[PDB]
Amino acid sequence: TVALTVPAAALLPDGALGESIVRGRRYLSDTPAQLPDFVGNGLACRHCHPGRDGEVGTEANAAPFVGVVGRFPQYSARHGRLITLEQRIGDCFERSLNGRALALDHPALIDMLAYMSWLSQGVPVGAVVAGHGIPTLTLEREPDGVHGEALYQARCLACHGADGSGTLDADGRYLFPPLWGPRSFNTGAGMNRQATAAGFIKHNMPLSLSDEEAWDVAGFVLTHPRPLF
């Protein structure tokens, strides 16, 4: 693998590309507000692809976009064929954002691509960046949702809510995003899979959990309704 590096925003070039990248960051950070026609719930890309200092998709084991462009096209079992990065973004619009894929030459989509390509500067095509994706967590027993409920109340509820509906900020963006219910990800999302949710939670939430705790609280989270895909 190669190291995960985050480029300096102060070395963004002047011109069309630089302006595109800045727009791309905003689309990824503020997606419901910026692309209402394509988003069907309360999630922005950054809610599962977080980053620091205003960037998006820069955190190891939270599916960083650093180095993503050199990994596409790639086979998708979902599609039964090779897909492009543009198509992969469409998938998370349709599933994680319970919405509609942008046209593959949509200027907002190209801006998102430009941003991901900026984050990926210097990464060799085909190389795997350390910390890519969301590592799954799988245990050799059923997740205990009763235990998970107790864990949720103690470790998650203060942010994500008794009803899993999250916490809005002053500008109407989710400070703490919804984990279930009508404004959360739909059943087609990867985050609706036990081992992916458990993996995400293990590596990223709160903010630490044992494997058993992550497994069990993920189970509890996924007992709830959410939009159907």
Ligand code: HEC
């Ligand atoms: C509900 C959580 C969630 C939201 C919201 C979300 N994603 Fe994802 N995304 C995932 C998960 C989970 C993966 C799979 C990571 C892996 O392969 O390990 C993923 C994978 C991706 C990948 C492929 C990453 C890779 O390394 O191959 C891209 C590109 C991507 N998402 C773009 C987006 C964009 C753009 C948005 C905003 C429109 C978005 N996602 C919103 C959960 C989310």
Ligand code: HEC
């Ligand atoms: C201090 C507040 C806080 C606590 C406590 C917290 N979270 Fe989160 N959670 C967030 C924020 C903010 C995000 C959006 C991603 C980010 O910025 O890291 C998030 C994202 C998530 C996501 C992906 C986004 C979504 O809407 O589905 C899941 C799943 C999640 N948290 C589950 C949990 C679980 C389970 C716990 C308890 C173990 C937990 N979180 C504790 C603030 C919190």
